[PDB]
Design an enzyme around this catalytic site. Sequence first.
Site, PDB file in Angstrom:
ATOM      1  N   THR A  56      -5.028   1.064  -3.626  1.00  0.00           N
ATOM      2  CA  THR A  56      -5.583   2.021  -4.585  1.00  0.00           C
ATOM      3  C   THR A  56      -5.211   1.617  -6.010  1.00  0.00           C
ATOM      4  O   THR A  56      -4.028   1.540  -6.359  1.00  0.00           O
ATOM      5  CB  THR A  56      -5.067   3.438  -4.304  1.00  0.00           C
ATOM      6  OG1 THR A  56      -5.554   3.866  -3.035  1.00  0.00           O
ATOM      7  CG2 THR A  56      -5.543   4.410  -5.369  1.00  0.00           C
TER       8      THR A  56
ATOM      9  N   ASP B 239       0.822  -1.201   0.000  1.00  0.00           N
ATOM     10  CA  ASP B 239       0.000   0.000   0.000  1.00  0.00           C
ATOM     11  C   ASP B 239       0.848   1.239   0.000  1.00  0.00           C
ATOM     12  O   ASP B 239       0.530   2.232   0.643  1.00  0.00           O
ATOM     13  CB  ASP B 239      -1.010   0.017   1.147  1.00  0.00           C
ATOM     14  CG  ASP B 239      -2.248   0.823   0.804  1.00  0.00           C
ATOM     15  OD1 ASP B 239      -2.372   1.258  -0.361  1.00  0.00           O
ATOM     16  OD2 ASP B 239      -3.119   1.007   1.682  1.00  0.00           O
TER      17      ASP B 239
ATOM     18  N   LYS C 166       1.952   4.527  -0.992  1.00  0.00           N
ATOM     19  CA  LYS C 166       1.301   5.681  -1.595  1.00  0.00           C
ATOM     20  C   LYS C 166       1.580   6.893  -0.691  1.00  0.00           C
ATOM     21  O   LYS C 166       1.892   6.717   0.497  1.00  0.00           O
ATOM     22  CB  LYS C 166      -0.194   5.422  -1.816  1.00  0.00           C
ATOM     23  CG  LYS C 166      -1.046   5.245  -0.587  1.00  0.00           C
ATOM     24  CD  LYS C 166      -2.478   4.926  -1.033  1.00  0.00           C
ATOM     25  CE  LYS C 166      -3.489   5.168   0.089  1.00  0.00           C
ATOM     26  NZ  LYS C 166      -3.242   4.317   1.286  1.00  0.00           N
TER      27      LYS C 166
HETATM   28  N1  LIG Z   1       1.411   8.325  13.496  1.00  0.00           N
HETATM   29  C1  LIG Z   1       0.579   9.151  12.871  1.00  0.00           C
HETATM   30  N2  LIG Z   1       0.761  10.489  13.040  1.00  0.00           N
HETATM   31  C2  LIG Z   1      -0.100  11.355  12.444  1.00  0.00           C
HETATM   32  N3  LIG Z   1      -1.283  11.079  11.918  1.00  0.00           N
HETATM   33  C3  LIG Z   1      -1.322   9.790  11.487  1.00  0.00           C
HETATM   34  C4  LIG Z   1      -0.511   8.751  11.976  1.00  0.00           C
HETATM   35  N4  LIG Z   1      -0.940   7.531  11.451  1.00  0.00           N
HETATM   36  C5  LIG Z   1      -2.045   7.843  10.789  1.00  0.00           C
HETATM   37  N5  LIG Z   1      -2.341   9.203  10.788  1.00  0.00           N
HETATM   38  C6  LIG Z   1      -3.331   9.768   9.852  1.00  0.00           C
HETATM   39  O1  LIG Z   1      -4.438   8.891   9.722  1.00  0.00           O
HETATM   40  C7  LIG Z   1      -4.582   8.425   8.344  1.00  0.00           C
HETATM   41  C8  LIG Z   1      -4.962   6.948   8.403  1.00  0.00           C
HETATM   42  O2  LIG Z   1      -3.901   6.142   9.006  1.00  0.00           O
HETATM   43  P1  LIG Z   1      -3.748   4.692   8.376  1.00  0.00           P
HETATM   44  O3  LIG Z   1      -3.219   4.780   7.029  1.00  0.00           O
HETATM   45  O4  LIG Z   1      -2.963   3.820   9.262  1.00  0.00           O
HETATM   46  O5  LIG Z   1      -5.277   4.240   8.346  1.00  0.00           O
HETATM   47  P2  LIG Z   1      -6.032   3.187   7.496  1.00  0.00           P
HETATM   48  O6  LIG Z   1      -7.438   3.092   7.915  1.00  0.00           O
HETATM   49  O7  LIG Z   1      -5.225   1.976   7.569  1.00  0.00           O
HETATM   50  O8  LIG Z   1      -5.906   3.785   6.001  1.00  0.00           O
HETATM   51  P3  LIG Z   1      -6.438   3.368   4.486  1.00  0.00           P
HETATM   52  O9  LIG Z   1      -7.849   3.814   4.359  1.00  0.00           O
HETATM   53  O10 LIG Z   1      -5.530   3.922   3.408  1.00  0.00           O
HETATM   54  O11 LIG Z   1      -6.394   1.935   4.373  1.00  0.00           O
HETATM   55  C9  LIG Z   1      -3.226   8.751   7.729  1.00  0.00           C
HETATM   56  O12 LIG Z   1      -3.281   8.886   6.363  1.00  0.00           O
HETATM   57  C10 LIG Z   1      -2.787  10.017   8.497  1.00  0.00           C
HETATM   58  O13 LIG Z   1      -3.291  11.235   8.017  1.00  0.00           O
HETATM   59 MN   LIG Z   2      -4.574   0.772   5.586  1.00  0.00          MN
HETATM   60 MN   LIG Z   3      -3.746   4.478   4.738  1.00  0.00          MN
END
Ligand SMILES: Nc1ncnc2c1ncn2[C@@H]1O[C@H](COP(=O)(O)OP(=O)(O)OP(=O)(O)O)[C@@H](O)[C@H]1O
Ligand SMILES: [Mn+2]
Ligand SMILES: [Mn+2]
EC number: 2.7.11.19
Length: 277
Positions: free
Chosen positions: A172, A135, A137
């Site tokens: 994506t 993933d 990106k």
């Molecule tokens: N350690 C961090 N510090 C700052 N904000 C963060 C952090 N980790 C995540 N975020 C924010 O939250 C968003 C989502 O985190 P993450 O990618 O782990 O979630 P997800 O639900 O797995 O995402 P996706 O929908 O792409 O699968 C990130 O893109 C970022 O903006």
């Molecule tokens: Mn994810």
């Molecule tokens: Mn993500």
Amino acid sequence: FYENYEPKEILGRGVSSVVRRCIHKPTCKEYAVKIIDVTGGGSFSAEEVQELREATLKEVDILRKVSGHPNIIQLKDTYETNTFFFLVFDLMKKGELFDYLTEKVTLSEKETRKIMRALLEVICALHKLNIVHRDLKPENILLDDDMNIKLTDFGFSCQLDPGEKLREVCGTPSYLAPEIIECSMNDNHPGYGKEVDMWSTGVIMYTLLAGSPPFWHRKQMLMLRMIMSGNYQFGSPEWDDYSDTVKDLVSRFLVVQPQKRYTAEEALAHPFFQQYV
Ligand SMILES: Nc1ncnc2c1ncn2[C@@H]1O[C@H](COP(=O)(O)OP(=O)(O)OP(=O)(O)O)[C@@H](O)[C@H]1O
Ligand SMILES: [Mn+2]
Ligand SMILES: [Mn+2]
């Protein structure tokens, strides 16, 4: 979780989770907490909820395995209940590389070399351990105070047994390697592996410079056909100011045939990164 941390504002949200800034009560230091609701909702049938629980566990597992790298997010704490997972990471203040690219529109070749070098070093480390991120990106690459890159989101990541291949389509579409799309079209396809990260890395580097995706279209159908054929070009109106050296690098990533695509170790050895040897 809430007995040790004070939940703050939303930093992000994912398909089944929410990421919030939070304060560690004892220390008063701030962190980010990715809260995953394993039970989700309607499509989360009796079986689906478990699909997520196991995936989250894999995520945490990979996180623990890569903990310690200067440019990978550090998992600090975890909590679990019959519904949610609570992953605590260091807070990334300068947000996403995506957000940054949004404002900057495009990045210089020198800046991109800075970011790409760090990214490749991370992927090289992941690949050395036979872990595929799946993933890669801008949205999953965060920035710290010093604007240093921090690879995050190991939710689709997998540590592979020697020779192990994957077949699931996730991530994506615009960043999907051709092999992934191929696999979905034909069951008799050998599945895919680590090389997909390298295609994604290609898409990323290209977008950093061009401020736009190598492959895109109104209809997903044709977009995917473009990816498969590898029909992308260094647009006449944008790519003028960049050296051909970078364009050679970008092209070595965007190779439809996995076996003939650049590896992280090769990419780092390319001319583009050898100025001070
Ligand atoms: N350690 C961090 N510090 C700052 N904000 C963060 C952090 N980790 C995540 N975020 C924010 O939250 C968003 C989502 O985190 P993450 O990618 O782990 O979630 P997800 O639900 O797995 O995402 P996706 O929908 O792409 O699968 C990130 O893109 C970022 O903006
Ligand atoms: Mn994810
Ligand atoms: Mn993500």
